[PDB]
Amino acid sequence: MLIAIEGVDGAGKRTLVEKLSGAFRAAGRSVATLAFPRYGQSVAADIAAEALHGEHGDLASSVYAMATLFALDRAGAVHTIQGLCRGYDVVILDRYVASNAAYSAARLHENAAGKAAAWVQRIEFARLGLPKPDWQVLLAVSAELAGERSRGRAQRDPGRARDNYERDAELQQRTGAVYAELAAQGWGGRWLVVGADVDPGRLAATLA
Template sequence: MIIAIEGIDGAGKRTLVDGLLEPLQATSLAFPRYDESAAAQLAQAALHGEMGDMTDSAHAMAVVFALDRHGALPVLERYAGNPDETIILDRYCASNAAYTWARTGDAAAADWVAELEFNRLGLPKPDLQVLVATTPEVAGERAAKREADDAQRTRDRYERDRALQEATFAAYAALAHGSWASPWVSTTDSAVIIKAVHALR
């Protein structure tokens, strides 16, 4: 099974993923894969102002992030439709849908992302998506503290943009409400997620 943990920067996704690994006997994978993916590294460079005007195009950035996920397709295919093994993803395709929607102000961007990632690139749809429902205010404070505590965690262009984070949170909420691509739960409680996963099995 593929479980995607989604939310804005600083929402607490990584903490939640780590807390689910043992109860669900799962492995994990985080996107973007900055340590191993050329596409992710290009996106990271763009977000830190090193790729000219690349970040000005919401669609160009979405394509680069999608190509990063496509590079992990062999891994994802091992878990798709297999209830005996579980992978928990720290971000997946919905992050592209939410950020592209927020950046363009166009709800149709979510459909464009679905066509790009699931149809054109053949990525498997997740069995369950979780919106970590941390408010933009709290998430922003966490992201700023993380940056202050760790010199390696400098916030990028998206993370520093408070209005973008708020718009992305609203887009995520709409995606969850509309069950974009697959079922969703909106929570910060790992017990709720574990119960939802067991119900799907």
């Protein structure tokens, strides 16, 4: 089973992955986790991050260029994902294809039924062959709280200055809204919308 944890930056995704992993292992399931972007491992991922921090000229100014880099990173992980699904009972991804749909649509002020979301569908799932997840869990949080976390993280870690998207409060707001639409639409597969207070044990039971 392939599960993707989605949400805006600062939503608490990494923490949910950790808690969920423990819940699954408690239930006797083998668990593997993979996070996107695959920084260090993927040049596309690194260039994208660098672009979001002021490098590489006009690269970040293009919505589709950024989406393409994140898609190329995932395309290079297809073998990894297939291998993990063959080796473990549960594979949990911290961010996946839906991240591209949410942020891309938001940057263009489009909704989940828009052009960008459809483009991501055609490119990543169909053309690049990324498998559709069995579950996509939206960790919904208020834009204000998520933002406060992204800022706090930058104040405590010098190698963690916020990226261009995180410095755009309205973009974060719109991204959260597109995520809610994607979930209601069942974009790319079935979704579950949860909060930071969700019970790992029950969530794992629902997913397994």
